[PDB]
Design a binder for this molecule. Structure first.
Ligand SMILES: O=C(O)C1=C[C@@H](OP(=O)(O)O)[C@@H](O)[C@H](O)C1
Ligand SMILES: [Cl-]
Ligand SMILES: [Cl-]
Ligand SMILES: [Mg+2]
Ligand SMILES: [Mg+2]
Ligand SMILES: [Mg+2]
Length: 169
């Protein structure tokens, strides 16, 4: 089972923190989005476009539950995985790190040409605030440690992480 599970919105640092936290703890990183593409042979975008979000969430839930059982390092969950009650259920008892980010920073950090079915222009900032508003309680419900990525250098938020895992609370 994973040493840590990372949850948060797109732009919250899951891939980069994942990377730094993993190096720090000395294990591998798995991203569930990558795992979905591997198992299905399909792009995330294609699944949403052709089969739709609900089918994506079912696939995602199965991949996440498997990953929680089978992987021993750091696991990063796609930003919408916590909307699935079965995912929240499976997270019970794990160490779960919520990477908190404000809308402005999150919006800035997601503004490239990455394909994002749920965060595509125009009015991306409105869409991001909507996701935040809906998902905030769900991240909070599952998380065992929260870290602020808004201002801190990454390598730092991670110190908060490696240090935190280690001592009581
Ligand atoms: O907000 C979402 O529902 C999604 C976030 C993405 O994960 P990241 O947060 O890893 O980009 C990816 O799973 C997909 O585009 C759906
Ligand atoms: Cl790494
Ligand atoms: Cl899901
Ligand atoms: Mg980096
Ligand atoms: Mg893809
Ligand atoms: Mg299916």
């Amino acid at each position: 089972a994973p040493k840590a599970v990372l949850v948060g919105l797109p732009g919250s640092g899951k891939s980069t923190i994942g990377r730094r936290l993993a190096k720090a703890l000395g294990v591998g990183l798995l991203d569930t989005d990558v795992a979905i593409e591997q198992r299905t042979g399909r792009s995330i975008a294609d699944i949403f476009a052709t089969d739709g979000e609900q089918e994506f969430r079912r696939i995602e839930e199965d991949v996440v539950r498997a990953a929680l059982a089978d992987h021993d390092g750091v696991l990063s969950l796609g930003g919408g995985a916590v909307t699935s009650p079965g995912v929240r259920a499976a997270l019970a008892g794990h160490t779960v790190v919520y990477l908190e980010i404000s809308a402005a920073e999150g919006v800035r950090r997601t503004g490239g040409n990455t394909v994002r079915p749920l965060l595509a222009g125009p009015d991306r900032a409105e869409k991001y605030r909507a996701l935040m508003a809906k998902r905030a309680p769900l991240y909070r419900r599952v998380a065992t440690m929260r870290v602020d990525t808004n201002r801190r250098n990454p390598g730092a938020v991670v110190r908060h992480i490696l240090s935190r895992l280690q001592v009581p609370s």
